[model samples]
Target: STGFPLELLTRPATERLAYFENYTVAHPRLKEVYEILMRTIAEPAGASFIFVYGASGVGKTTLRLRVEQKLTELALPKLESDRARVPVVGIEAIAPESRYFNWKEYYTRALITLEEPLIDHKFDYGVRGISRDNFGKINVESKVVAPALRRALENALIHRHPDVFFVDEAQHFGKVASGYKLQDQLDCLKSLANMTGILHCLLGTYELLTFRNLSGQLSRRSVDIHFRRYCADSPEDVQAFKSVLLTFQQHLPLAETPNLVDHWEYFYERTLGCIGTLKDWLKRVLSDALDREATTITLKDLQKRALSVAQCQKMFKEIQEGERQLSETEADVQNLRSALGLG
Candidate 1:
């Protein structure tokens, strides 16, 4: 009885959707990955730039909010005397407004967010290279370059001393000079992290996997965490997904409980085993049920809200490509069991 969603189902009709909107499950994959981040978030040995990559609906941002919240909470008690200390911080990649990496925009915002009050925004363009002017500012005539912002960040990082910095959907701008500028910007992040001993984390889709080259090149200061979706072939994966389904059913705000897990495979097909997509899909179903004044959700409701066959195929195709790429392990004479360390 305690496990059922009696309280949720009995809530005011309009408020049920709000509850579901804020609701999230710390499922197996999320918990496992998040725990590792907590341990490494404050690395005394100097944290590496951690790249978190996965499929579109595989709960990347959800896990981020979870991690960010806990880290900030962990730092709360020490904030009183450590007045200048910023425990955590993040900034958006802003792909739509300006597709390419804008180091100036990023630095200005980063400065303000890190409690910076002044930035030498006025720069003289005609001024000679690397020379301190009468104003004691190099390139004080031009717009802010990487070095301009870099100097400000190094100081702010020292003053604020945050353990982690975030750039969400960092793969968004992977199209523009992403071939050239992408790799170039990486060394910048690497340089910043090593000097400050802070973590620079990029959360993005598997598009970030293509940059896994840095994982090998900068092996000491770069790491990758692959957030994954459940797979039908893995028995544990199947079990975890169904357990998720059952939990959602129990929490569904219907007078009669929906038998969602009874058709687990169908849900998996529509969701491609990503719980974030499944949660959104079911929310639509619940909303539709409320529209019809139905007491409980049904197969018809689910079908109407499910992702279309063609769309599922497109997503699934991309997801498989990403999964295979991330799981790469080169072998001269491949023996699955031997590589798995079981042989």
Candidate 2:
């Protein structure tokens, strides 16, 4: 009887959506990843860059938020000069319609996120008569814009003295236009690390592999950390995933919780072992149940909320196929190196 209020069902759908979004579950692996991230940022001098890559619904955003929370808790005290120290700063990449990497916009976003003082008012381009209007509008030439943006970013990094900077959707760096190669984009990120002496954490999906392989410097400087989804084929993974489901069922704000544990395999099959996907699907089911004035979730509710069997099978097959291809490619490269005495 110690569950959510029955009156909650009478509330507006928006309120229910907010509740679902705010609810988070922490598993062992997620906590472990957060610890690794915390250790990486704790040592500012010896900090090394990290790349966190995973599938879309593997809870990368959730993990990032956990790390951000930890950083906030561990933030250093402000100085006597009234300057606050930011332990971590995060920025997300935006892809234009052309799908090309935009360094000026990226740097401007980082400066804005850090609340750079110079960025508050008009930036005076003393020589070219270009004002803050041109910079904000992105109407200036790269030759003129790059130096100014870099200077602003450097000033902010120096003032904040953040231990680490996080860039989400970093795989977009591979989408550079003809004028700038992927290596150029990588070099820019590496340059920022070198200039600020701060570690950078890049988060992305599978496309990050290509982004990371572009430059040898990047490969040597960065550590690759994979946030993998639960694999149904692995017994340990399946058990852990089932435990997650049980926890979700227990915490679900419903008068009568559904028997989600019994449907563990069914849920895993539909969601491809992604916890985020499972939560989202359950949210949909709960919303539909509320609409129907049902006190408990039913098998029919789950069936209605889930994707068709054919669709799930198709997606799972494609994901497995991509994994197989990657493994085969890695084997072929290893064979070639050994044969050529380059191994």
Candidate 3:
């Protein structure tokens, strides 16, 4: 019998996904990447910038969160010193209004995450007699705002003494406005790491490669780590994915578990070997089963609950094109070398 609680099955369908308990499936590659992250964070001298990138849905967020959790477990006990010590801090890069990147907002958000007391009341008061306009808007100049943000950030970093600072969704740095080249954005981050003497862990999609290539200094000071998805073309990967599916099936709260391994290829085709997509798809399937009061899951249920053709097609095409581009770039380099008599 699956030891899942009966109460879980009777819960509302919407709550099923939220209630579903999933553990970090640490396969070989995932373990390898985690070790690299741990080693980078443990370095005492020479602050470094590290980039961890992968395709969408390849579990970048999961890995980052796992690292954060591990660091929390390994954090040092608070001392009698006056300053606080934060071993790790993580924040995502996001725009305020538009999709374009904003440096001020990024630093402000980081300061907020650090819980710096100075930033808590940053916009609370105004320089003049009034704090807001008739429409309740605080007016502040860029010169004043920028210096205040820098001071708060500096204070937080100094007090917290963080071992590593993680910036997720770092590819947003590539979306800066005109005149702010990608290099400029990257330089800002580099400067922050240099000033704070804390390791910078940048996580994003493949687009982050461009950010890394902008500066020779960045390349020299950073370590690039890639997280790859499972591929159906590789027997080992397919087997690993099948094992993951089996684990999921075991965790299902149904009275009778489904034979998910029997339809591994079907699941792989729909999810493009992405564990995140597979997990989400399975959640939908479980929710549907709960709605129907079904005691078990089936391939038919998965078929009916699968992603739309358009969505799957777009994702598959993106994967194929990325692979094509990598191959083409390799061939181009080879051709250039041959032409230059270096082959």
Candidate 4:
């Protein structure tokens, strides 16, 4: 599923862009995070939760899609013997309309994703003082109790267990006021992972930095992987970024390709060193070039589509603060020692 596609050059303009869209560069940072997640999934009793986060547009959606395929392929071997088991399980945590989360929505999604049909019919409960109709189907108008939904979800998970359950856009789980038993909210997910022996992976933006340690129990059971952007000053990372830039250019599928690596600094600046942003930026550049019936992309095309300085500034500042929250060093050590009266 991962290789430079030389064949896309023959396709139409729109088709060519998808090769760029669908491709994800397995850069140094993303590879490390992938390895860590795979290792955690390998262990029979690995961390029940994997909190994998980064700044928005740092290729998390790509990472999630990539890992889902990996798990499915790996499960192919296992499925030879265990035919009924699922390879992976997950549902994106959509932003709920309610001020609070709608676990009822997620629970139903999980059940459906697990291949459970007739969800309305499965629950036997005269739930929440709600009625049952002709064939004992609960009234469509009556709300399904969250507790019963959880049990059904739990049953589906156990019966058709998958190794990893990824919640994309998971930081939406952090939307509520923290004091609103947010601890209990995660505990609900924690309980499902523990009970079913399935690893729960939360993939989200930097908003999840706050979610990393919601409670001591969560911290204990979760493996944290931060897939960050390329650092501008880091010698190896800068070179890696240029390498990725070259690869993208080579795959542009035009008669004459832009030498994107020539002004890597400008590219890096516009994207704030994030490959995902660079990819999107380049797609727009490609689109503009295609519309003009041009043989190749040009510097002007790139510059026109590049993110403005002000936009980059906002994302850049957030990335810095997000990294700060993840950092620990000798300063922390000294503070600990002084606080203990060892000064």
Clashes of each: 8, 0, 0, 0
| Poorly placed runs, candidate 4 (over 4 Å) | 1-11, 44-46, 116-141, 178-180, 333-343
Per-candidate local distance difference test: 0.75, 0.73, 0.73, 0.77
| Between candidates 1 and 2, the lDDT winner | 1
Return the TM-score for each candidate structure.
Answer: 0.83, 0.80, 0.80, 0.86
The number of the candidate with the highest lDDT is: 4
Worst 10 residues of 1 by lDDT: 121-130
Please write out the lDDT profile of model 2 over residues 289-310, one tens digit for every residue.
Answer: 7687676889888889898889
Candidate 3 backbone collisions, by pair: none
Q: Candidate 1's error at 331, in angstroms?
A: 3.4
Q: What's model 1's lDDT at 260?
A: 85
For residue 125, model 3's alpha carbon misses the true position, in angstroms, by 17
lDDT of 1 by residue, 1-343 (tens): 5244567666776888887778787688888889877777757354467888888889988888888788878888887556667678887776646556666666656655655322333322222332334544233224547576667667668667787898888786464555667666677667777776677888998777766675455566677788888998889999999899988887777788788878999999999899899999989998988778798887988899898999999998888888877775756336776788866
Displacement of residue 29 (Cα, Å) in model 4 is 1.6
TM-score, predicted candidate 4 vs. hidden true structure: 0.86
Q: CA shift at 170, candidate 3, in angstroms?
A: 1.1
User: How big is the positional error of residue 99 in model 3, measured in Å on the Cα after superposition?
Assistant: 6.9
Question: 1 or 3: which has the higher lDDT?
Answer: 1
The digit string of per-residue lDDT tens for model 3 on 117-149 reads 332233433223223344444333456566566
